[PDB]
PDB file of C-alpha atoms in Angstrom:
ATOM      1  CA  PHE H   1     -19.514  18.673 -15.088  1.00 18.86           C
ATOM      2  CA  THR H   2     -17.033  19.468 -17.862  1.00 20.89           C
ATOM      3  CA  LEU H   3     -14.414  17.276 -19.503  1.00 17.94           C
ATOM      4  CA  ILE H   4     -11.707  19.742 -18.471  1.00 19.54           C
ATOM      5  CA  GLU H   5     -12.829  19.298 -14.848  1.00 21.60           C
ATOM      6  CA  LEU H   6     -12.489  15.517 -15.082  1.00 21.81           C
ATOM      7  CA  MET H   7      -9.192  15.631 -16.980  1.00 19.95           C
ATOM      8  CA  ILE H   8      -7.697  17.922 -14.331  1.00 20.55           C
ATOM      9  CA  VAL H   9      -8.878  15.419 -11.706  1.00 23.91           C
ATOM     10  CA  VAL H  10      -7.257  12.556 -13.630  1.00 24.41           C
ATOM     11  CA  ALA H  11      -4.003  14.507 -13.974  1.00 27.58           C
ATOM     12  CA  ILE H  12      -3.936  15.336 -10.257  1.00 25.57           C
ATOM     13  CA  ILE H  13      -4.689  11.683  -9.457  1.00 26.53           C
ATOM     14  CA  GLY H  14      -1.692  10.653 -11.543  1.00 27.72           C
ATOM     15  CA  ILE H  15       0.494  13.328  -9.947  1.00 27.78           C
ATOM     16  CA  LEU H  16      -0.601  12.315  -6.437  1.00 28.55           C
ATOM     17  CA  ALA H  17       0.477   8.795  -7.367  1.00 29.04           C
ATOM     18  CA  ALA H  18       4.074   8.107  -8.492  1.00 29.86           C
ATOM     19  CA  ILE H  19       5.318   9.106  -5.023  1.00 28.43           C
ATOM     20  CA  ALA H  20       8.503   7.084  -4.617  1.00 26.40           C
ATOM     21  CA  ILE H  21       8.413   4.598  -1.733  1.00 23.45           C
ATOM     22  CA  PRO H  22      11.915   4.076  -0.271  1.00 25.77           C
ATOM     23  CA  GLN H  23      13.180   0.846   1.232  1.00 27.13           C
ATOM     24  CA  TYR H  24      11.729   0.039   4.657  1.00 25.86           C
ATOM     25  CA  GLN H  25      12.562  -3.609   5.427  1.00 27.00           C
ATOM     26  CA  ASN H  26      16.078  -2.592   6.493  1.00 26.64           C
ATOM     27  CA  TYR H  27      14.617  -0.429   9.265  1.00 28.49           C
ATOM     28  CA  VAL H  28      12.437  -3.299  10.491  1.00 30.03           C
ATOM     29  CA  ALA H  29      15.356  -5.746  10.418  1.00 27.79           C
ATOM     30  CA  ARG H  30      17.608  -3.347  12.339  1.00 32.74           C
ATOM     31  CA  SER H  31      14.900  -2.717  14.938  1.00 34.68           C
ATOM     32  CA  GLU H  32      14.342  -6.469  15.305  1.00 33.66           C
ATOM     33  CA  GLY H  33      18.057  -7.030  15.859  1.00 37.20           C
ATOM     34  CA  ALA H  34      18.209  -4.246  18.439  1.00 39.26           C
ATOM     35  CA  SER H  35      15.138  -5.625  20.224  1.00 39.63           C
ATOM     36  CA  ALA H  36      16.597  -9.138  20.331  1.00 37.50           C
ATOM     37  CA  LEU H  37      19.933  -7.881  21.663  1.00 33.98           C
ATOM     38  CA  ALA H  38      18.192  -5.776  24.317  1.00 34.90           C
ATOM     39  CA  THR H  39      16.086  -8.810  25.256  1.00 36.46           C
ATOM     40  CA  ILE H  40      19.015 -11.198  25.754  1.00 34.10           C
ATOM     41  CA  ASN H  41      21.512  -8.661  27.146  1.00 35.11           C
ATOM     42  CA  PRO H  42      20.199  -8.630  30.769  1.00 34.06           C
ATOM     43  CA  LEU H  43      20.463 -12.434  30.850  1.00 32.59           C
ATOM     44  CA  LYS H  44      24.242 -11.977  31.069  1.00 33.57           C
ATOM     45  CA  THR H  45      23.791 -10.497  34.549  1.00 32.33           C
ATOM     46  CA  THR H  46      21.691 -13.453  35.712  1.00 33.24           C
ATOM     47  CA  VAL H  47      24.162 -16.085  34.489  1.00 33.76           C
ATOM     48  CA  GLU H  48      27.218 -14.274  35.856  1.00 34.43           C
ATOM     49  CA  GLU H  49      25.601 -13.625  39.239  1.00 35.73           C
ATOM     50  CA  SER H  50      24.394 -17.223  39.562  1.00 37.67           C
ATOM     51  CA  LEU H  51      27.852 -18.542  38.678  1.00 38.72           C
ATOM     52  CA  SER H  52      29.415 -16.140  41.192  1.00 39.68           C
ATOM     53  CA  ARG H  53      27.157 -17.442  43.980  1.00 40.40           C
ATOM     54  CA  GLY H  54      28.047 -21.055  43.160  1.00 40.04           C
ATOM     55  CA  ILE H  55      24.832 -22.115  41.418  1.00 40.52           C
ATOM     56  CA  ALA H  56      25.620 -24.863  38.925  1.00 37.69           C
ATOM     57  CA  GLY H  57      25.532 -23.851  35.279  1.00 36.71           C
ATOM     58  CA  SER H  58      23.138 -26.685  34.463  1.00 37.67           C
ATOM     59  CA  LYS H  59      20.763 -25.241  37.089  1.00 32.20           C
ATOM     60  CA  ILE H  60      20.498 -21.855  35.322  1.00 32.09           C
ATOM     61  CA  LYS H  61      17.355 -22.214  33.203  1.00 30.10           C
ATOM     62  CA  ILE H  62      14.861 -19.890  31.519  1.00 28.86           C
ATOM     63  CA  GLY H  63      11.320 -19.525  32.813  1.00 33.50           C
ATOM     64  CA  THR H  64       9.047 -17.801  35.284  1.00 35.65           C
ATOM     65  CA  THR H  65       9.368 -20.564  37.897  1.00 37.71           C
ATOM     66  CA  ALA H  66      10.373 -19.160  41.286  1.00 39.01           C
ATOM     67  CA  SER H  67      14.145 -19.492  41.611  1.00 37.62           C
ATOM     68  CA  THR H  68      15.234 -21.427  44.694  1.00 35.29           C
ATOM     69  CA  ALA H  69      18.541 -21.353  46.575  1.00 31.83           C
ATOM     70  CA  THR H  70      19.967 -23.969  44.183  1.00 33.37           C
ATOM     71  CA  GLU H  71      18.091 -23.225  40.932  1.00 34.02           C
ATOM     72  CA  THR H  72      17.936 -19.889  39.108  1.00 31.41           C
TER      73      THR H  72
ATOM     74  CA  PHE D   1     -44.378  27.235 -46.069  1.00 31.67           C
ATOM     75  CA  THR D   2     -41.946  28.659 -48.628  1.00 29.56           C
ATOM     76  CA  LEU D   3     -38.997  27.035 -50.368  1.00 28.67           C
ATOM     77  CA  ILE D   4     -36.693  29.716 -48.959  1.00 25.57           C
ATOM     78  CA  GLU D   5     -37.856  28.728 -45.458  1.00 26.52           C
ATOM     79  CA  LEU D   6     -36.984  25.077 -46.072  1.00 29.92           C
ATOM     80  CA  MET D   7     -33.677  25.844 -47.793  1.00 25.48           C
ATOM     81  CA  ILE D   8     -32.601  28.009 -44.852  1.00 27.41           C
ATOM     82  CA  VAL D   9     -33.502  25.097 -42.562  1.00 25.25           C
ATOM     83  CA  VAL D  10     -31.437  22.709 -44.699  1.00 26.79           C
ATOM     84  CA  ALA D  11     -28.479  25.109 -44.686  1.00 26.97           C
ATOM     85  CA  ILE D  12     -28.644  25.524 -40.905  1.00 25.67           C
ATOM     86  CA  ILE D  13     -28.905  21.737 -40.526  1.00 25.65           C
ATOM     87  CA  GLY D  14     -25.730  21.358 -42.570  1.00 26.86           C
ATOM     88  CA  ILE D  15     -23.989  24.111 -40.603  1.00 28.51           C
ATOM     89  CA  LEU D  16     -25.040  22.579 -37.272  1.00 25.12           C
ATOM     90  CA  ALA D  17     -23.454  19.362 -38.516  1.00 22.48           C
ATOM     91  CA  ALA D  18     -19.763  19.294 -39.541  1.00 25.01           C
ATOM     92  CA  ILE D  19     -18.779  20.064 -35.932  1.00 26.18           C
ATOM     93  CA  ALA D  20     -15.358  18.459 -35.594  1.00 21.32           C
ATOM     94  CA  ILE D  21     -15.190  15.680 -32.995  1.00 25.91           C
ATOM     95  CA  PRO D  22     -11.697  15.479 -31.436  1.00 23.20           C
ATOM     96  CA  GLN D  23     -10.040  12.304 -30.224  1.00 23.89           C
ATOM     97  CA  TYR D  24     -11.471  10.936 -26.973  1.00 25.16           C
ATOM     98  CA  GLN D  25     -10.161   7.372 -26.552  1.00 23.93           C
ATOM     99  CA  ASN D  26      -6.857   8.731 -25.224  1.00 21.34           C
ATOM    100  CA  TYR D  27      -8.690  10.357 -22.311  1.00 18.57           C
ATOM    101  CA  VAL D  28     -10.486   7.101 -21.494  1.00 16.43           C
ATOM    102  CA  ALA D  29      -7.253   5.096 -21.690  1.00 14.51           C
ATOM    103  CA  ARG D  30      -5.418   7.550 -19.425  1.00 15.19           C
ATOM    104  CA  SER D  31      -8.268   7.518 -16.903  1.00 18.40           C
ATOM    105  CA  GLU D  32      -8.307   3.707 -16.957  1.00 20.30           C
ATOM    106  CA  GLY D  33      -4.570   3.596 -16.294  1.00 20.61           C
ATOM    107  CA  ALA D  34      -4.888   6.075 -13.432  1.00 21.96           C
ATOM    108  CA  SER D  35      -7.791   4.104 -11.945  1.00 22.45           C
ATOM    109  CA  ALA D  36      -5.860   0.830 -12.140  1.00 20.94           C
ATOM    110  CA  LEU D  37      -2.775   2.372 -10.532  1.00 20.38           C
ATOM    111  CA  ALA D  38      -4.875   3.916  -7.754  1.00 23.66           C
ATOM    112  CA  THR D  39      -6.565   0.541  -7.237  1.00 23.30           C
ATOM    113  CA  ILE D  40      -3.348  -1.469  -6.857  1.00 23.92           C
ATOM    114  CA  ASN D  41      -1.275   1.213  -5.094  1.00 19.93           C
ATOM    115  CA  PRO D  42      -2.691   0.667  -1.553  1.00 19.51           C
ATOM    116  CA  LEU D  43      -1.902  -3.053  -1.859  1.00 20.37           C
ATOM    117  CA  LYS D  44       1.768  -2.114  -1.420  1.00 21.71           C
ATOM    118  CA  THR D  45       1.007  -1.103   2.172  1.00 22.40           C
ATOM    119  CA  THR D  46      -0.695  -4.427   2.921  1.00 22.34           C
ATOM    120  CA  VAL D  47       2.155  -6.548   1.544  1.00 19.25           C
ATOM    121  CA  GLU D  48       4.885  -4.502   3.232  1.00 17.25           C
ATOM    122  CA  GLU D  49       3.089  -4.455   6.587  1.00 15.68           C
ATOM    123  CA  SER D  50       2.385  -8.197   6.475  1.00 15.94           C
ATOM    124  CA  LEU D  51       6.019  -8.930   5.617  1.00 13.16           C
ATOM    125  CA  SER D  52       7.153  -6.631   8.439  1.00 12.01           C
ATOM    126  CA  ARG D  53       5.014  -8.525  10.968  1.00 12.23           C
ATOM    127  CA  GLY D  54       6.423 -11.872   9.815  1.00 11.54           C
ATOM    128  CA  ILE D  55       3.443 -13.160   7.826  1.00 12.34           C
ATOM    129  CA  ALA D  56       4.684 -15.484   5.096  1.00 15.44           C
ATOM    130  CA  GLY D  57       4.569 -14.096   1.576  1.00 17.90           C
ATOM    131  CA  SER D  58       2.620 -17.121   0.359  1.00 19.04           C
ATOM    132  CA  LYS D  59      -0.014 -16.311   3.009  1.00 19.58           C
ATOM    133  CA  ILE D  60      -0.692 -12.817   1.596  1.00 21.30           C
ATOM    134  CA  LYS D  61      -3.687 -13.363  -0.690  1.00 23.88           C
ATOM    135  CA  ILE D  62      -6.428 -11.226  -2.234  1.00 21.37           C
ATOM    136  CA  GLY D  63     -10.023 -11.488  -1.074  1.00 21.38           C
ATOM    137  CA  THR D  64     -12.591 -10.370   1.458  1.00 23.67           C
ATOM    138  CA  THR D  65     -11.968 -13.335   3.778  1.00 22.90           C
ATOM    139  CA  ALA D  66     -11.275 -12.191   7.339  1.00 22.02           C
ATOM    140  CA  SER D  67      -7.506 -12.043   7.801  1.00 21.66           C
ATOM    141  CA  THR D  68      -6.254 -14.141  10.710  1.00 23.17           C
ATOM    142  CA  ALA D  69      -3.049 -13.828  12.739  1.00 23.79           C
ATOM    143  CA  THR D  70      -1.200 -15.947  10.153  1.00 23.21           C
ATOM    144  CA  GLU D  71      -3.058 -15.110   6.915  1.00 22.32           C
ATOM    145  CA  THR D  72      -3.620 -11.646   5.447  1.00 22.41           C
TER     146      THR D  72
END
């Protein structure tokens, strides 16, 4: 092992560092907003259809309970 | 043993000395800086990933304790 060998390794370590890391939280925030909008968008169909069929607005709830003829 | 033998030995001892020693603390300092940067560089990934997944910034600590769903 020579000192030139180790100094070249140190220089290449420094060069391999310093790689600029761009902003990434904006991408995550935008994806979260898109996911939320895509999650709550189909619920417009449920509310509108239930209101069209006469189901009371107070009877339109959120859950996995089996919807009856009066509750959705 | 002759005096010329010993004087040649003394002269070669003096010649074998006087070898200039260049600066070396700069190399050690540069290697230490590179090692520190390479040590703390991967911690950027941990912090960014934990913040992306919603883990609170105050919950991102340093240690070998097993990270839970809320602490990293």
